[PDB]
Copies of this chain bind each other. A is one copy, B any other.
């Protein structure tokens, strides 16, 4: 399975409430499973009722489908956003060729999922990153540094 699913394990999740912010349900979930969590300020819905017998990965997928959420896990923190926070950004390094940049982005983070997708575009020496804000920021910072190292040689 995924690293996130492998970390969440197989112990099922139980909660009940008459009304709590979804932020608080997500927080209490992640923390039950010992997984550091970030929740965007856009995740402002309310949750009511009960979950039981639910496998953790299924809890997260069902919360995400109903509330229109996309998550991004980088082995350290689970970042939870609204799906509407996904954007596109073009990265065009000056000193480093884009094929080599990919070879460094691809062996240290997912580059295929809807939460963080990287692909070469037609624009010369250019890639488009499509993902949640933490994805864009991290790939943009890494690329800038990699480009700065190529400029030194």
User: Could you list which residues of chain A lie within 8 angstroms of chain B, going by C-beta atoms?
Assistant: 23, 27, 30-31, 34, 36-38, 40-41, 76-77, 96, 100, 103-104, 107-108, 133-134, 137, 141-142, 144-146, 148-150, 152-153
Chain B: minimal CB distance from A4 (Å): 16
Query: Smallest CB–CB gap between A136 and chain B, Å?
Result: 9
Q: Which residues of B contact A41 (CB under 8 A)?
A: 30-31, 34, 36
CA distance A152 to B76 in the complex (A): 27
Asked if residues B149 and A104 are in contact (CB atoms below 8 Å), the reply is yes
Q: Count the copies.
A: 2
Q: Give the residue of B40, B76, B100, B145 whose beta carbon is less than 8 angstroms from that of A142.
A: B145
9 contacts between A and B (CB under 8 A): A36-B40, A76-B133, A96-B149, A104-B148, A142-B145, A145-B145, A146-B146, A149-B149, A153-B153
Shortest Cβ distance from A77 into chain B, in angstroms?
7
Query: Which B residue sits closest to A100, measured CB to CB?
Result: B152
Judge whether B134 and A76 touch: CB under 8 Å.
Answer: yes
A131 → chain B closest CB, angstroms = 13
Bound: A37/B40 CA distance, A: 8
For A40, the chain B residues whose CB sits under 8 A away are 36
B residues within 8 A CB of A104? Answer: 145, 148-149
A36-B38, A103-B152 given; 4 more Cβ-contact pairs under 8 Å: A23-B27, A104-B145, A145-B145, A149-B150
